[PDB]
Enzyme design. Structure first.
Site, PDB file in Angstrom:
ATOM      1  CG  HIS B  46     -30.999 -24.557  66.725  1.00 34.08           C
ATOM      2  ND1 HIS B  46     -31.535 -25.320  67.742  1.00 34.08           N
ATOM      3  CD2 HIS B  46     -30.064 -25.332  66.120  1.00 34.08           C
ATOM      4  CE1 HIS B  46     -30.944 -26.503  67.754  1.00 34.08           C
ATOM      5  NE2 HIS B  46     -30.053 -26.539  66.778  1.00 34.08           N
ATOM      6  CG  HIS B  48     -35.808 -21.811  67.593  1.00 31.01           C
ATOM      7  ND1 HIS B  48     -36.600 -22.839  68.049  1.00 31.01           N
ATOM      8  CD2 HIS B  48     -34.526 -22.192  67.824  1.00 31.01           C
ATOM      9  CE1 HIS B  48     -35.843 -23.794  68.546  1.00 31.01           C
ATOM     10  NE2 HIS B  48     -34.580 -23.434  68.425  1.00 31.01           N
ATOM     11  CG  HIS B  63     -34.968 -26.213  64.456  1.00 31.41           C
ATOM     12  ND1 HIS B  63     -33.886 -27.046  64.261  1.00 31.41           N
ATOM     13  CD2 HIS B  63     -35.189 -26.189  65.793  1.00 31.41           C
ATOM     14  CE1 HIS B  63     -33.483 -27.512  65.427  1.00 31.41           C
ATOM     15  NE2 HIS B  63     -34.259 -27.015  66.372  1.00 31.41           N
ATOM     16  CG  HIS B  71     -32.119 -30.674  62.860  1.00 29.29           C
ATOM     17  ND1 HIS B  71     -31.983 -29.317  63.079  1.00 29.29           N
ATOM     18  CD2 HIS B  71     -31.077 -31.263  63.494  1.00 29.29           C
ATOM     19  CE1 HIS B  71     -30.925 -29.105  63.838  1.00 29.29           C
ATOM     20  NE2 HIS B  71     -30.358 -30.268  64.107  1.00 29.29           N
ATOM     21  CG  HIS B  80     -34.726 -27.324  59.900  1.00 33.30           C
ATOM     22  ND1 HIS B  80     -34.676 -27.861  61.169  1.00 33.30           N
ATOM     23  CD2 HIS B  80     -35.592 -28.092  59.200  1.00 33.30           C
ATOM     24  CE1 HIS B  80     -35.503 -28.892  61.231  1.00 33.30           C
ATOM     25  NE2 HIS B  80     -36.060 -29.059  60.049  1.00 33.30           N
ATOM     26  CG  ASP B  83     -30.985 -26.976  61.065  1.00 29.55           C
ATOM     27  OD1 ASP B  83     -31.630 -26.535  62.038  1.00 29.55           O
ATOM     28  OD2 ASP B  83     -31.357 -27.951  60.378  1.00 29.55           O
ATOM     29  CG  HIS B 120     -30.414 -25.379  71.944  1.00 26.81           C
ATOM     30  ND1 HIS B 120     -31.587 -25.807  72.529  1.00 26.81           N
ATOM     31  CD2 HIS B 120     -30.765 -24.779  70.783  1.00 26.81           C
ATOM     32  CE1 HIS B 120     -32.602 -25.478  71.752  1.00 26.81           C
ATOM     33  NE2 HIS B 120     -32.134 -24.856  70.684  1.00 26.81           N
ATOM     34  NE  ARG B 143     -36.606 -23.675  72.200  1.00 25.13           N
ATOM     35  CZ  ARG B 143     -37.704 -23.471  71.482  1.00 25.13           C
ATOM     36  NH1 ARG B 143     -38.330 -22.297  71.524  1.00 25.13           N
ATOM     37  NH2 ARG B 143     -38.177 -24.444  70.712  1.00 25.13           N
TER      38      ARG B 143
HETATM   39 ZN    ZN Z   1     -33.140 -27.727  62.474  1.00 28.88          ZN
HETATM   40 ZN    ZN Z   2     -33.132 -24.813  68.973  1.00 24.78          ZN
END
Ligand code: ZN
Ligand code: ZN
Ligand code: 9JT
Ligand code: 9JT
Ligand code: ZN
Ligand code: ZN
Lengths: 153, 153
Positions: B46, B48, B63, B71, B80, B83, B120, B143
């Site tokens: 991701h 962020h 995100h 998402h 997002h 993503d 992740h 994370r």
């Molecule tokens: Zn997302």
């Molecule tokens: Zn994330």
């Protein structure tokens, strides 16, 4: 307002947190925070061009210089955008940073987000060292700690 | 062409280097590199919102979602900007990353420079997990490593 932040990491541990705040795109950037683990005295404080810390601070490249100027201090007309001068560490090794700068920005082609903030071994001579290197780097020695400047909430 | 780079580090064994390249303004972004120290399988990947790593990865925020969508996965319309789905680690714990994405950018409103790339603990379910959290975060757990996406040469 736009806000940015940077975590400075390097051996010592030299470590710091630096905040950037700009109320409008046409305004000065307030720079504040703290760096610890430094020797007492002046330490060069630069925005280097690349936010590339893949080999640590050595990958960050030259001083951020979008206008192709020579090296100076922050108060000089003749300076690189990334020339933020020196921070001052006390006898406990702590530099409390409080700068306002009118040349760096958090938007446009003087934008420093995504670039590398660096604190140096020695003082930046601000282009007044009396050699060729003085007007390119300021003779601040090794890169003690650095980090990539990121967008903050 | 515009290029960016990110060093992924965390509190545990996970570390990586990820490169971004965008040949043409508003063209797709190539993402490639390597991450090691992972459990074998899928790991949520991701961008962020904040390039704020002052408390490690926990300060990076939600995100990156400038278009206020739900998402999803990278090949979904409903996603997002941040993503990027999952990376895949092998039995040596290594994920070789090779992605092309046409939603992220290295300039403008969709720009990911100065934001945090995060890998992740668990798989991103890509909005298909069967709970409310699925269409907000994708349920990818902790994370493990992150870094701020910087401008590269
Ligand atoms: Zn997302
Ligand atoms: Zn994330
Ligand atoms: O907006 C930026 N540059 C930029 C440069 C020239 C014209 C307009 C805008 C920027 C790019 C990358 C990272 C951070 C910023 Se602030
Ligand atoms: O380039 C950027 N924005 C931007 C915004 C409007 C016009 C042109 C450019 C940017 C800003 C902050 C972080 C990263 C980037 Se890529
Ligand atoms: Zn420097
Ligand atoms: Zn300079």
């Amino acid at each position: 307002a736009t806000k940015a932040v940077c975590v400075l990491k390097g051996d010592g541990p030299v470590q710091g947190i630096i905040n950037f705040e700009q109320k409008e795109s046409n305004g000065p950037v307030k720079v504040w925070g703290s760096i610890k683990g430094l020797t007492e005295g002046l330490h060069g404080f630069h925005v280097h061009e690349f936010g590339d810390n893949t080999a640590g601070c050595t990958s960050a490249g030259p001083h951020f210089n979008p206008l192709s100027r020579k090296h100076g201090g922050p108060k000089d007309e003749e300076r690189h955008v990334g020339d933020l001068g020196n921070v001052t560490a006390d006898k406990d090794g702590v530099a409390d940073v409080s700068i306002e700068d009118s040349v760096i920005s958090l938007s446009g082609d003087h934008c420093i987000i995504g670039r590398t903030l660096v604190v140096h071994e020695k003082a930046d001579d601000l282009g007044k060292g009396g050699n060729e290197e003085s007007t390119k780097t300021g003779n601040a020695g090794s890169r003690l700690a650095c980090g990539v400047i990121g967008i903050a909430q």
